[model samples]
Target chain A: SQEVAKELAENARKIAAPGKGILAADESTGTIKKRFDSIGVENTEANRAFYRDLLFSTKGLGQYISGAILFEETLYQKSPSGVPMVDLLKAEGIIPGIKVDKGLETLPLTDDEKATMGLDGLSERCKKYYEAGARFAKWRAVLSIDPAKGKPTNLSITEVAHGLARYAAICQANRLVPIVEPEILTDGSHDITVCAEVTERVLAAVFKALNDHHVLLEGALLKPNMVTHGSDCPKPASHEEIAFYTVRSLKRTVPPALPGVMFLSGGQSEEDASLNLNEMNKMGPHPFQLSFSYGRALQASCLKAWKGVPENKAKAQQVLMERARANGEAQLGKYGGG
Target chain B: SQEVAKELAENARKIAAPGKGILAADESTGTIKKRFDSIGVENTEANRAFYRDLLFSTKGLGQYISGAILFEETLYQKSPSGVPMVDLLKAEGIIPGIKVDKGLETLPLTDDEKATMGLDGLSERCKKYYEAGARFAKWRAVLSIDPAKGKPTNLSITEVAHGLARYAAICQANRLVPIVEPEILTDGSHDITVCAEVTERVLAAVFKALNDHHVLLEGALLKPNMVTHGSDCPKPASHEEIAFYTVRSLKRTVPPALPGVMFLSGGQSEEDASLNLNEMNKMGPHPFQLSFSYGRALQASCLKAWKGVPENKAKAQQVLMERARANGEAQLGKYGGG
Candidate 1:
């Protein structure tokens, strides 16, 4: 057990390696389609492979991207040159991770919200992924703010928290470093403070469930949504307010044994996501690495550049390279972009 | 939401239907061994069938037993006479129930144990069982006492509770009554009061999880272990103490929406278990029904009588009749056992 814990802590430290962050290519097929539509690409398996390959194939990415999380298909996919995407990342000295959850489904009797429950056969899945050279796993649970109701009820928050804990324990039991993500969806018309409160509730419940599950605290990383205003809120807060609330909330809920707190970009613009993360890192007293696990923030520019064409592949790769570098600088509170 | 709460409350009351208790035959293959050994019968599929059939086949049992829980094997098994077990239970007006958990396993990093999860495809399993005529289900979680350790530093109880809540929600999603059984094991050296303390903690955690998961409390029964001294305790408390502490514990932790508390006999002698139920029933102000969801206490005599012989079926039925009659009377505090 000590050996396992040690290995997990080591993996956590490596994933949060200084000036480096995770590249989240772990979007589900349905979510990936939404991204593909933005770039006018049909969301076929080949297209998904092509998109992820473009990101993973970026030159010099390993210097800033410690790992690239793969969906089941992409974990085993090979590029047109016949190079396995996983091999491509390994060749660049980046560890490979897998997104293990099937996706969220509706919580019974809830209003348009869902609970993530793909943890059913996760241990066996983790073992298979480990054999296939994945050293880490990610399971994302979504909690949305409902301003029409009195914020998302404590029940909604606790449900997501317990789900995260169960997923994390299963991942750890199989010796995989779990990136425990509980993203409070930025979909409401609530202000930044509402996000802070809901995020606090979500994070507290996650830690409590993790403690209840006896997951070794020192061996995991937390991937959370940064505290920010609802997307449609009239008074969406500035980066300073978002960063202050995010860091303060993390201090209150994220346990020290966790090696890092990587924030998902949710629906933020590339600059906003990077700027908020950089500001959060600047206000230090943070127990874990304050970094980004972005999808759109990392790839929006690249998708725009590539437009699904082979001739623009190098330019798309450069877009990824610049975004990765910006987030890498954000991890160190040094991102200079406005 | 008020309407949903009202529906859930109504369902809870119906499942806790008056004077009817659960029939727990959910023992795993290995646990069935100990029961078989006690009666000097070989523990095999046929032998288990013989014993369970004796109980299920008991004449006029529906007046007392609302449901009969079966292990996976027994759920689809047939009597020697070729009558399907589920069909036989339904013929007697008893609801057929299935135990849907794998056995308990040790919790990581603690001496406590968690019930093995068998929830993979549980929704599909519930549908199949419903198609085959099962109307109820049981998921038992094990908890044990450790006085030297103060509170048991274990994740097993909470993990099992969470698992049971998930199973209950899934079952409710499929319209089956989920009997939430968090059985605190009686194998420790603790006394009845200690059992009460731990039962309180276990039940509190369970109901909280159920609430969190939005499980329909009205459509479920709680088949819990009784708060009583350990089997090997040198100074076991009186039946009245057991009754008092047990009811008190349940009152504090169990929600009023729960229809009833059908307690496991937990290795008690038939008369002792019966007397404790009688005493508990005699005590005042219980919000839930205090009755029996017994396996061995309901089966030991019948198994010893049957001894796997077809000719002894009627005699075995008589033994089951006596056990059921005693328990029936105990439910009304009227037991005058032989």
Candidate 2:
């Protein structure tokens, strides 16, 4: 128990280390296909592997990124040159993590609610993932706000919470640090206040589920949506307002024993994501690290710059480096929105 | 939602009818063997059938028993005389029910703390059980106190809570009233105060879970251990003390939307069980019915009277008849414990 706990706690701290956050390159084939199409890249295996190599093999990523979450197939993949892709991150002292959730399905008998799957053989899966050199794992469970209809009903929230807690425990059994993510979708017309309230409710319940499942707070990390106005809210909230409410909710709900809270972009623009995170750190002295686990926010600019062109790979990686560096500064309250 | 909610709420009210409560004879075959051995009765299909017949065939069992929880085997069994076992209870106006949990297994990472199983394929099982004339279901998850070790760790409490909540949701889905039982074992030397505190913690976590699982509080019944001293405690708490602490904890944690609180015997004697419950009702005007769903406390005397003798069948049934009547009075604050 001590050995497992020690290693897990150590990984949590490393992943949450100051001035560094996560690189979320763990998009599934289905998810990455959409991104690949947008960039005019074929979604073939060779193409996917080359894209992963470009991102993971990027020089200087480890300076601002402490861990990279990979999809299942990527955990077992190697570069065309026969080098294991998972090794690139490890080579630079960055932890390799795997995404373990099977994605969401409609929760029957509810108004289009959903629950995450993939628990069928999670323990064995985690064991294999660990054996494949992945030292941490990520699982995402989503909730949404619909003030008129009480969307993301208690049933949906509890399912997400329990889903997360179960995954967290199974990962710890295999000594993988689990990033507990419960992203509340900003799909309603509700204001920032509703988002803040629902975020508080969701996080509070998630921690209770974590506590119930006997998850080691010291060995786990939380990745949640930043509290912001709903997507259709007429008046947008400022980064300061977003930072204040989001961090206040975290302070109210997320326990201090957790090593970090990595805010998901959840549709925020790259600059806005960094700005909000920077504001959070500026509020200063949170019990845990506040950082980013961005997917698009960290990669959108990089992909657009490259357009899948081999000759532009280096320039594309430079954009990736800049994004990581900016978020790194934001993780420490120092981003200037460049 | 309204139709499902209305049916579930109506069934909950019927189960919590005044001056009545549940009859918990839902012992697994393995459990029944132990109880049968103590009475010197052979544990056999025939013997089990005969004993159940003796109890259910008793005159006036329905006056005090609004529901009867049967083991899985008994749900399909018939009397040795070819009468359907389930029919005997329904013949006397008792609603048929079944115990659905597969019992407890050790929580792998914890120090022998356990979690309930049977969630796999639970929906189908509830459908089958509901189709077999069972109008309700029982699922028990237990916790124990070991102050020295901080036993019933948050992991155990949460596991138990989630198990009960999950079971409740499935039962409500199939329109079976769910008797949510989280029994805290009284096997320590802790004082009544510790027991009261743990009860509060356990119930609070459970209700949160129920909320998370989107269980309809109005359609659920709570069957918890009555608050009292641990079995090894040197000083015992008074009936009044037990009643006050027990109901106080319930009021603080359980929502009044729930129709009733049916407490388990949890090692209390027949008299103690009835006395404690009577005292609870004496507190007067509780938001829900305070009643009992007992096994040993309601059967030890009956079994000793019968002692596996056919000639003693009527005599044994009389003892059963009396235990039922005594608890019936206790359900209404009128038990003299005579």
Candidate 3:
């Protein structure tokens, strides 16, 4: 266990390095295809590679992003110029990470609740990824809230927590830092108070499971969905309100031993995500690093600017750089919005 | 939410009535076969029915056993006198109950942990059981400890709690009082302290899940393994020590709203089971009823006496009645064992 513990802690610390965060480019092909369609781009492998290349090749990205989480395919693929995608990140002094979850499976006896899959051969996979130059890994286990129907039942929370803990333990055992992601969906009609309550409960369960599994908290980073009003709520919460509830929930549940808690954008716009992170940092004195491991929040503007055009690559990279810088500043309570 | 709350509470209350306990005669076919094997009885339907008939038809059974949990087959089978078994229970003012779990399925991603099955069509089954004169139901989800291998991981505890809660909710929805059984095995070589600690964690998770599922505590009963030293421990725990740890664990986790807490005599001898229960009640003033819902502990002597012979039937009935009365007295802290 000590063989990996030291390396895992070092990697986790690097990912949570001061004023830096993760670029979550680990969206599956299908997920990215939907984002690609919005920009009228084909979902071909070449285009996907080019898009990731544009982000990885961003000039001076290492200033803000300490790591880039890649899908398995991207982890092994080559850029147009022949350098491996992982090499691109390594060259920028950014740690490379891989997404290892196989996606969600419907939990039996529930209306539509789900548990994350892909634990069957996770240890071997983590070892392979580690050998392939990955220093960290991500697993997303989803939970949803619909208080009216009791959607995020205890069964769902328990299942999700167990999945994330198992994944974290395996990742640690293989000498890779684990991003323990228990993403509670923002797809309900509940208000901010309900979101905070549910998020607190979910985080408490997640940490308890992690402790039970004997995962070294210093070797794991949490990637949690920020507490906010449900997407369809009639009254949306202000960034300050969101930050308050989010940090308050984290304080009550997350142990100080955990290195950092990276926030998932989870349908928030780029501006809102940055602003909320900024507000949380402004609130101050939280034990874990308050940062972001954002996918769409860090990529939406770049995708719109790129539109898969050769001529737009420079502009796309600029947009990516700007958003990353803003979030980086937000991580230190200093984002003034681009 | 309170739709069937009153009826469920009433049923739970009657089953946990003063000086009374449940008769756990719901052993599965395989389990019954093992018990029958010990006495050299054929594991046939006729023998099974006859054995259950002997237990249920004992004179004055209702004075001690307020309810009798029946296997599905026994729930429908008739006595030698051609009377439906459920009718015999009802005739004596003893409630008939059903065991709804289909047994344990191996949990994926764990060496030996399991999740209880039968939830696929549990609601329908509960409805049918309720319609067939079953006023209560039991679902057992098991966990074990081998601290060396981290055998009873939090993952196992969470899954077991989730399964039990889901089952309890369905049973309540169908107007059947639920006996929530999350039995921790006593097969380790650990001390009573380990047992107490594990039991506390397990029960805490169970109640938390029950709360999350909105299962009314007043309508449910807990059937847990009484805390004790492992079977193979060099020094076994005394009855007073077992009762002390068991009640202490319950007091720390179980809510007062729950109607009763019944002890499952998992591997405990008949005398030990009664003595433990008596000690618990003697400890005095616990918020919930302390009683026994024991199978082997309540039936070992009876089965040995009967030996599936007509000439021995009366003797077996005497053994059954005596055990029941002893346990009944135990519930009131009055058992003076022979």
List the candidates ranked by TM-score, beginning with the highest.
1, 2, 3
Whole-model lDDT values for every prediction: 0.80, 0.88, 0.89
Better structure of 1 and 2 per lDDT = 2
| Residue A313 alpha-carbon offset, candidate 3, angstroms | 41
Give TM per candidate. Answer: 0.86, 0.65, 0.58
DockQ (Cα-based) for each candidate: 0.36, 0.14, 0.06
TM-score of chain B of each: 0.91, 0.98, 0.98
Q: Rank the candidates by DockQ, best first.
A: 1, 2, 3
lDDT of 2 by residue, B34-56 (tens): 98899788998998998889888
Off by over 4 Å in 3: A1-338
- Which ten-residue region of model 1 chain A has the weakest summed lDDT? A150-159
Query: What lDDT is reached at residue A199 by model 3?
Result: 92
Per-residue lDDT of B1-338 in model 3, one digit per residue for the tens? 46689999999999999999999999889999999999888998888888888888888899999999999999989987788999889878999999998887555447768767666567778889888999999999889889998979867887788778777877887899999999989887999999999999999899988887768899999999999988888776988899889999999999999989988998888998899899999898789999989899989999999987878999999999899999999999999976
DockQ of candidate 1 relative to the true structure: 0.36
